Every structure is written in C-alpha cells, then in structure tokens.
Design a binder for this molecule. Structure first.
Ligand SMILES: [Ca+2]
Length: 262
C-alpha cells in the first residue's frame, strides 16, 4: 500500500466539499523570516494517519497573502500543510517569487514551530501561486527540480519557454483574463512544458484575472486532486484527472493523461 494515502476514498462530492476531512490549525510566521515576507501556515490537526506534504503559495504583483488565504483551510483540510506567503516586496518579479517560495519551503523544513515540523514530510513539497506568483511557481520548479508538483494559477511570466521542467505542473487559466491572458501566458507555458511531463491546463469559462483569489469549487477540487496525485502519489485521485474533466465551468482542458504511476 501507498504509505502517503490520507483520508477516505474520494468521491466527486468529497473533493468539492468546502471542509475536507481534517480539522485545520494555523501558525503565523513573522516577516523577519529569512528569504520571504512571512506568512500563515495552515495544517491538519489530526496526526494519527501520518505526516503530510506541503505546498507554498505565492500571491501576484502588488498583492499579499490575503489574496490567497482561502486556499489555506480549503486545501489543508484535505491533508496538506499550506503556507500562504507574503513576498519581500509587493513589487517582486517572478524569479524573486520563485526564490521566495523555496525559502518558505525551507523555513517549513528547517525552522518552523514544532507543531508544524512534527506534521511535515520534508521530502514531499509543492508550489502554487497566482499571476506573477504563478510565474514564480514555474521558476521554483527549475530552481528546485525535486518538487513534487507545481500549480501556476492564471500565471504571468515574460519567458514563454519551460521545456526542461520535470515537476508535474497544472496550469489554470481564466478565459476572459486581460492581465495574464491565456493566449500569451498560460497556454504558451503549457505547450512549452515537455510533451512527456505529467501536466494539465484548465481554462475557466467566463473567469477574469482575480478568479483564483476567491473560493471556487472547480479550482479547489482539481488543485486538491493534483496535490493528492503528485504530492501523495495517491492514485485514488487519478479518476478525477484522467480522462480530462468535463465540468460545465471548464471551457477548455488539455492534459498528458495517463499519468503513469511511476
Ligand atoms: Ca523576511
């Protein structure tokens, strides 16, 4: 059996639920932490199923952790440590945001309070971010190729080539976004990732740039499924990812399914 499985066998209803099966606690991290602007760690309270993987979550240009706060309880309650960070400055660029995502992960591994550290599997780490923070998610996977997953949400980056990334990457685009338009950001990034990388692209019908900053069940269910599949190696979640989702909220989906269990 896979020792990283947590929680009951999933259903489409259970991955859409606002509160997953774990209760959640928080730990605040001061902005004086090294290499990033501090943040909030959301973690599952229950320990008897084992330790958990972690995802560091970055905001976009001129945004702060509050724009990403809803991921904390939503995702942690399905069995993840979720660290919503602030950046060094509000004006930081995608490369800087990638470096800071890594600094936040290293803080979890090396410096976090014992309540977090005792719940963490330091070998199973992921990144996620919105807009320039999604560019940061891409960057972080080049800077740290041992990451288990990357989730660029309506990502923004001037560099359109990501052909050496080896970290499973799930890009979410917003159909009507004019700040990080999918035609020039999300889709080029997706198509530039290796054809043989486990990857997906989900475009949300009607959505605008700030769609990832408020609760969105279509985002949540597939973010949870991606993190389960890749951070936890949990093939009970393959059923939601492959074949491609058909939810009405989705206007286009691309993938490299099947994601062979490796
Ligand atoms: Ca700092």
């Amino acid at each position: 059996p896979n020792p990283y499985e947590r929680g009951p066998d999933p259903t489409e209803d259970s991955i859409e639920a606002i509160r997953g099966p774990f209760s959640v606690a928080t730990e605040r991290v001061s902005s004086f932490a090294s290499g990033f602007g501090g943040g909030t760690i959301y973690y599952p309270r229950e320990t008897d199923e084992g330790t958990f993987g972690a995802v560091a979550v970055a905001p976009g240009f001129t945004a702060s952790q509050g724009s990403m706060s809803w991921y904390g309880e939503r995702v942690a309650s399905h069995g993840f440590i979720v660290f919503t960070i602030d950046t060094n400055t509000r004006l930081d660029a995608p490369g800087q945001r990638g470096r800071q995502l890594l600094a936040a992960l290293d803080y979890l591994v090396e410096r976090s309070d014992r309540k977090v550290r005792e719940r963490l599997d330091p070998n199973r780490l992921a990144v996620m971010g919105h807009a320039m923070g999604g560019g940061g998610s891409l960057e972080a996977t080049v800077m740290r190729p041992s990451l288990k997953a990357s989730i660029p949400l309506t990502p923004w980056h001037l560099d359109k080539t990501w052909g050496q990334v080896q970290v499973p990457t799930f890009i979410i685009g917003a159909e009507l976004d004019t700040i990080a338009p999918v035609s020039t950001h999300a889709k080029p990034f997706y198509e530039s990732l290796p054809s043989s990388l486990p990857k997906a692209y989900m475009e949300l019908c009607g959505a605008t740039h700030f769609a990832p900053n408020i609760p969105n069940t279509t985002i949540a269910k597939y973010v949870i499924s991606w993190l389960k599949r890749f951070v936890d190696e949990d093939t009970r979640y393959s059923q939601f990812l492959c074949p491609n989702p058909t939810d009405r909220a989705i206007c286009e989906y691309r993938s490299t399914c099947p994601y062979k269990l490796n």
